[PDB]
Structures are given as C-alpha cells and as structure tokens.
Amino acid sequence: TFLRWASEPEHDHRKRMGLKMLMMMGLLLPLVYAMKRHKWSVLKSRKLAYRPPK
Amino acid sequence: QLLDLAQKHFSSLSGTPCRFTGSEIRHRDDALPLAHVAIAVEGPGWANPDNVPLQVANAIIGHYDSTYGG
C-alpha cells in the first residue's frame, strides 16, 4: 500500500476529482443533449411536401 | 331618414379564441423572379389599447418601395 502511494501520490485526489467529474458529466450530458434536441426539433418535426402545379 | 328606412325594410328580419403558433411555411419555387416574405408575431385584439402605440411603432419602421422618391 505504501508503494502504491509512492508510485501514485495523487491517487486519492484523482479519485475525488473523478467522482466530481462523474457527477458533473451526469448532470451536463442530459442538459446539453436537451439543448441539442431543442435546437434540432425544428428540423426533426418539419414536414416536407411536393406540390407540382401539373 | 335612414332609421325609418331601416325600420321599413329591415324590420322583417330574424331577431373560440384562436391560438397563435410560431411556425413557418416555405414554398420554395426558384422559377419566380422575386421572393416574398411575411413575418409576424401575435398581436392584440381590436379592443386592446396597445393597438395605438404599436401602430406608432410600425409608423417608425415605415414602408418602402422601389418607386419611392425619398
């Protein structure tokens, strides 16, 4: 365990930052995904029609 | 005179708030010489006082035509 600390002195802090980034990403990915869906709904719901006068 | 005429002729007579939707219709037709565009927003009713300032606002935007000498 001491050698593990010696090789990775940032182990604990790395895990802490990883937990924080996991929380932030789990919060952000749905939010930015919702923003993308909001912007793209104009095209996703659009309905095209073809009306040749003939 | 008009009232008595109406009583003579018109006496023998029988005794849904619309939803504004932000959308677009594009009729793409490249054969036409010029493109017409009409963009609007939900306005007030006849009885709304805000019709008076809004017209003023439109008067500020004004109108133009290629034949205007201004």
From TrEMBL, chain A:
Belongs to the cytochrome c family. It comes from Sus scrofa. This is Cytochrome c1, heme protein, mitochondrial. The gene is CYC1. It is found in: Mitochondrion inner membrane. The lineage of its organism: Eukaryota, Metazoa, Chordata, Craniata, Vertebrata. Component of the ubiquinol-cytochrome c oxidoreductase (cytochrome b-c1 complex, complex III, CIII), a multisubunit enzyme composed of 11 subunits. The complex is composed of 3 respiratory subunits cytochrome b, cytochrome c1 and Rieske protein UQCRFS1, 2 core protein subunits UQCRC1/QCR1 and UQCRC2/QCR2, and 6 low-molecular weight protein subunits UQCRH/QCR6, UQCRB/QCR7, UQCRQ/QCR8, UQCR10/QCR9, UQCR11/QCR10 and subunit 9, the cleavage product of Rieske protein UQCRFS1.
Automatic annotation (TrEMBL), chain B:
Component of the ubiquinol-cytochrome c oxidoreductase (cytochrome b-c1 complex, complex III, CIII), a multisubunit enzyme composed of 11 subunits. The complex is composed of 3 respiratory subunits cytochrome b, cytochrome c1 and Rieske protein UQCRFS1, 2 core protein subunits UQCRC1/QCR1 and UQCRC2/QCR2, and 6 low-molecular weight protein subunits UQCRH/QCR6, UQCRB/QCR7, UQCRQ/QCR8, UQCR10/QCR9, UQCR11/QCR10 and subunit 9, the cleavage product of Rieske protein UQCRFS1. This is Cytochrome b-c1 complex subunit 1, mitochondrial. The gene is UQCRC1. The chain holds residues 241 to 320 of 480 of the full protein. It comes from the Eukaryota. Transmembrane segments: none annotated. Belongs to the peptidase M16 family. UQCRC1/QCR1 subfamily. It is found in: Mitochondrion inner membrane.
